[PDB]
């Protein structure tokens, strides 16, 4: 499923992925850790640190600064275990709250971040963070759009229709942005 | 197959995401 590596990266940019600053928080150079789409096909633990810290920070702020206080940036190995045990438990809780909608989190996926098994966990993680923010930034009069999105529809015509509504909304709202900033 | 309706639901997700994100800022910007 190539689009899984695709939508992920797009969804990565959806959270506002800026490869520079998010590499700057770790105190390391970009040239030694490549970002983008073709970054997790092989074992790549640095990109793992970066994307996982950004993904955990985008969803939570205070508890994220708490559980990753004695870990990040995990430059050494004694403090690395702290990161690997603080992230695995959280991902296990998240997977248990959703269940079949998530791949079962295994600590072994964190010993070598790469291959399709890591990309699967990463895409479902990105989906979860998107959704739990569609749960908070969408209006109280529109929270159902979240659960309407959790409703796993199976027919293609309704999927077409839903995309259709959303894309006309997209066009109109981007047009209103121009009206507001210019007028 | 399912992979295409998942593509559709994902793109709907992204539309909804970015739209709400720019709405919450434009409402702030107009006031």
């Amino acid at each position: 499923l190539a689009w899984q590596r695709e939508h992920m990266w797009l969804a990565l940019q959806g959270l506002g992925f800026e490869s520079g600053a998010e590499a700057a928080n770790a105190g390391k150079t970009l040239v030694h850790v490549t970002f983008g789409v073709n970054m997790f096909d092989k074992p790549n633990k640095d990109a793992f640190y970066v994307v996982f810290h950004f993904l955990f920070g985008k969803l939570d702020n205070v508890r994220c600064k708490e559980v990753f206080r004695y870990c990040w940036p995990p430059l050494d190995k004694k403090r690395d275990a702290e990161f690997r045990k603080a992230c695995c438990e959280w991902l296990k809780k998240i997977s248990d709250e959703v269940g079949a909608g998530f791949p079962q989190v295994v600590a072994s996926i964190f010993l070598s971040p790469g291959g399709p098994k890591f990309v699967h966990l990463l895409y479902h993680f990105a989906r979860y963070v998107m959704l739990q923010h569609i749960k908070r930034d969408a209006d109280a009069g529109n929270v159902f759009i979240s659960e309407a999105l959790q409703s796993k529809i199976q027919d293609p015509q309704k999927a077409l229709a839903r995309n259709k509504l959303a894309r006309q909304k997209y066009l109109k709202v981007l047009q209103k942005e121009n009206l507001v900033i210019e007028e | 197959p399912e992979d295409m309706v998942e593509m559709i639901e994902s793109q709907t997700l992204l539309l909804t995401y970015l739209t709400i994100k720019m709405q919450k800022n434009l409402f702030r910007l107009e006031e």
Binding site: L10, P156, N163, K164, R167, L171 | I8, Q11, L18
Partner: peptide, 19 residues
């Protein structure tokens, strides 16, 4: 469906590039 897909993703990536 692929046409709406393409228009979608293109508008997504290009609007993301707006400052």
């Amino acid at each position: 469906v692929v046409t709406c897909i393409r228009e979608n993703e293109e508008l997504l990536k290009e609007l993301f590039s707006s400052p």
